[PDB]
């Protein structure tokens, strides 16, 4: 929230230390309002508007169809976690330890430990 | 009962995707312009760091959910310049050139229905990533891909296909043949236009699902602001007044109690925000699954992409959400006829392939499980598999053979 | 690391070690500090347990999703688009992973494509011959029938199609003579 | 059952009955004990609601 070297005012705020270029590439380090910075071309930190990929038009007609001829086989991967490590936290060992008055005073908070 | 009439209906489903991105400060909310307060709060800096890390985690989780929801294809498609689809009319779902954004009329109508003071106490708003223009362009590209292909772009290369053949292929997925569409195309087009008009008139004066979250967030912010005026067992809610009228030796306990109360309030608010973020994540996962299993390709899951036989879907954008418009074919008027298991002609038990035998009261015809199509039972539509003494309830009826007159 | 670091803070006291406080002060003057330390440690443990419960709920949801995907992709062929990979799902090969599972789906995806003039149906002597499960294409003059997954031109016969009404019902329908292999078999 | 048994805890006091404390001590002295009891019960209720 600052009104504005290489100072540039974007819809996300104000960036100091990057020159805005005219070319648009893929998103890397996002900032906000559709802005992503990276480290490209001698090479320094520059700011540019992220692109939404390739833009192509499909030839639509009333008497045409695209029948595939050659086919390929591709294998994809997927990483999904299942479980994690089981951690146990002892109440007395973490609160008191080798004391007596502490253990006697902790008797009034045994329900929380349970 | 065999249905004879049908009516195309369009449903509407509202599902949230993301919510607001808020960030709460520790020193600005607890202390401010003081020294002893900061010295006492430095002992509880671990809690502040944990809360800031949780806020950053919620912020990046919202961005990840938005990226997973509003991203299905990698190529931006445009609408064809020729407005011809075979009787149908697609003019309300396309972005109007009069508006500066890439939103259509339905999107602008639904956006108007949804309705620095908070930043003074350290409650700032983080700038979102996916802007409205990018979401509108993504929705337009998805609509163009669906009207120029349907499901071929969602699994590989884009295959061109007319809208009539696409509609016929979608109707063939539920058992309905192509003659029903090639003979009653104008009726289906008029029914679809009437359904679109009814939906457009109903959406114009509802959207409480995209508003209850904002209302709860505003109420939580107001509660957090009002909690700064409470005493928490003291005499006032101003640290400067306490430091002026009372000495630090007699105000340290009060400052500690205030800090503890504010830390408990911040912990409760962070827990509520985590619960809301988990709910938003679940809703976004559900919306992404519905987008992948309804719009991209036609699925056979009963009651998942609408109420009835799902044909095609039109994805629409929404502020902090998404609008789904499915095509639910539902049968209407039906009649009453009599059925028959198999046919017993010359001892062989003829069973139909995929049709059903009906009779108006005298003659016996064979039709399908959808539309009433009276046909003549031939040798190519039925198969033999045994005798008539093993089938229970089989009647006696002759079987026509068109091969005999062709040989004479 | 956070639980380890939550042991040196004073929480409004003069020390963080219980043995240090009990060795310099008497219980009647250190009971309040002991109670404050116990309350702070209980609050820290409650926050940690809440975080662990949230993480356990997230792990439960992830495990349920992974088991559903496993049972729907490996133990069967599901027609759910964009669920068992990107393309037409064939089979899968589950693998082992520490605290996880690695998936190896098989996604048949078409590659090359061409352009051909398609037709909805073929009219003969006043009857529309709709295909049972194919599509009529042309290459300049002749007309063949192909499937929806491979370019296989076939001779327009009779048993491969079915009649339904006349030809004056289709907007854009062409005309082509049916070969009909039943006629040469009778000659 | 845990919420019911929480009413028997002392949370660093001398008893758990409010009337017993109000009848044995003057109001301008049991305020800290009442505040501690209220804080403990509010923490227990917050954990239960979570």
Curated annotation (Swiss-Prot), chain B:
Domain of life: Viruses
Impact when changing residue 363 to Y: In strain: Theta/P.3
Residue ranges of the region described as Heptad repeat 1: 185-232
Effect the entry attributes to changing residue 216 to H: In strain: Omicron/BA.1, Omicron/BA.2, Omicron/BA.2.12.1, Omicron/BA.2.75, Omicron/BA.4, Omicron/BA.5, Omicron/BQ.1.1, Omicron/XBB.1.5, Omicron/EG.5.1
Glycosylation sites: 5, 89, 336, 360, 396
Residue pairs linked by disulfide bridges in the UniProt entry: 26-48, 31-37, 294-305, 344-388
Effect of mutating residue 84 to Y: In strain: 19B/501Y, Omicron/BA.1, Omicron/BA.2, Omicron/BA.2.12.1, Omicron/BA.2.75, Omicron/BA.4, Omicron/BA.5, Omicron/BQ.1.1, Omicron/XBB.1.5, Omicron/EG.5.1
Reported effect, residue 153 to L: In strain: Eta/B.1.525
Coiled coil: 211-255
Effect on the protein of changing residue 121 to K: In strain: Omicron/BA.1
Outcome after substituting residue 380 to H: In strain: Alpha/B.1.1.7
Job description of the protein: Precursor of the fusion protein processed in the biosynthesis of the S protein and the formation of virus particle. Mediates fusion of the virion and cellular membranes by functioning as a class I viral fusion protein. Contains two viral fusion peptides that are unmasked after cleavage. The S2/S2' cleavage occurs during virus entry at the cell membrane by host TMPRSS2 or during endocytosis by host CSTL.
Entry protein name: Spike protein S2
Lineage, opening ranks: Viruses, Riboviria, Orthornavirae, Pisuviricota, Pisoniviricetes
Encoding gene (name): S
Swiss-Prot record, chain C:
Cystine connections: 73-84, 123-167
Known glycosylation sites: 115, 139, 175
Chain segments annotated as coiled-coil in the UniProt record: 1-34
Effect the entry attributes to changing residue 68 to I: In strain: Gamma/P.1
Cited function: Subunit of the fusion protein that is processed upon entry into the host cell. Mediates fusion of the virion and cellular membranes by functioning as a class I viral fusion protein. Contains a viral fusion peptide that is unmasked after S2 cleavage. This cleavage can occur at the cell membrane by host TMPRSS2 or during endocytosis by host CSTL. In either case, this triggers an extensive and irreversible conformational change that leads to fusion of the viral envelope with the cellular cytoplasmic membrane, releasing viral genomic RNA into the host cell cytoplasm.
Protein name per its UniProtKB record: Spike protein S2'
Organism: Severe acute respiratory syndrome coronavirus 2 (2019-nCoV)
Gene: S
Residues of the full protein shown: 960 to 1146 of 1273
């Amino acid at each position: 929230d600052v009104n504005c070297s290489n100072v540039f005012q974007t819809r996300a705020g104000c960036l100091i230390g990057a020159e805005h270029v005219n070319n648009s590439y893929e998103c890397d380090i996002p900032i906000g309002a559709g802005i992503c910075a990276s480290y490209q071309t001698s090479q320094s930190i520059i700011a540019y508007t992220m692109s939404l990929g390739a833009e192509n038009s499909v030839a639509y007609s009333n008497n045409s169809i695209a029948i595939p001829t050659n086919f390929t086989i591709s294998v994809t991967t997927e990483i999904l976690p299942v479980s994690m490590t089981k951690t146990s936290v002892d109440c007395t060992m973490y609160i008191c330890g080798d004391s007596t008055e502490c253990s006697n005073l902790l008797l009034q908070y045994g329900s929380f430990c349970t | 009962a065999i249905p004879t009439n049908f009516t195309i209906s369009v449903t509407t489903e509202i599902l949230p995707v993301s919510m607001t991105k808020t960030s709460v400060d520790c020193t600005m909310y607890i202390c401010g312009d003081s020294t002893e307060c900061s010295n006492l709060l430095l002992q509880y800096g671990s809690f502040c760091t944990q809360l800031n890390r949780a806020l950053t985690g919620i912020a990046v989780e919202q961005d990840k959910n938005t990226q997973e929801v509003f991203a299905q294809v990698k190529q931006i498609y445009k609408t064809p310049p020729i407005k011809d689809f075979g009787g149908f009319n697609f003019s309300q779902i396309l972005p109007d050139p009069s508006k500066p954004s890439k939103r259509s009329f339905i999107e602008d109508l639904l956006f108007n229905k949804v309705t620095c003071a908070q930043k003074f106490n350290g409650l700032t708003v983080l700038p979102p990533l996916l802007t409205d223009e990018m979401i509108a362009q993504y929705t337009s590209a998805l609509l163009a891909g669906t009207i120029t292909s349907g499901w071929t772009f969602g699994a590989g290369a884009a295959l061109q296909i007319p809208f009539a053949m696409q509609m016929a292929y979608r109707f063939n997925g539920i058992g309905v043949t192509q003659n029903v569409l090639y003979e009653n195309q104008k009726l289906i087009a008029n029914q679809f236009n009437s359904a679109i008009g009814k939906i457009q008139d109903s959406l114009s004066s509802a959207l409480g699902k995209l508003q209850d979250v904002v209302n709860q967030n505003a109420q939580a912010l107001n509660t957090l602001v009002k909690q700064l005026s409470s005493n928490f067992g003291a005499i006032s809610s101003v640290l400067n007044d306490i430091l002026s009228r009372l000495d630090p030796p007699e105000a340290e306990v009060q400052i500690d109690r205030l800090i503890t109360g504010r830390l408990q309030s911040l912990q409760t608010y962070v827990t509520q925000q985590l619960i809301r973020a988990a709910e938003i994540r679940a809703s976004a996962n559900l919306a992404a699954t519905k987008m992948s299993e309804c719009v991209l390709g036609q699925s056979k899951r009963v009651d998942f992409c609408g109420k009835g036989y799902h044909l095609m879907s039109f994805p629409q954008s929404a502020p902090h959400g998404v609008v789904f418009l499915h095509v639910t074919y539902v049968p209407a008027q039906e009649k009453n006829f009599t059925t028959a298991p198999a046919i017993c002609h010359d001892g062989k038990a003829h069973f139909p392939r995929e049709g059903v035998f009906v009779s108006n009261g005298t003659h016996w015809f064979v039709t399908q499980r959808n539309f009433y199509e009276p046909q003549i039972i031939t040798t190519d539509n039925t198969f033999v598999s045994g005798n008539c003494d093993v089938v229970i309830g089989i009647v006696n009826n002759t079987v026509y053979d068109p091969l005999q007159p062709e040989l004479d």
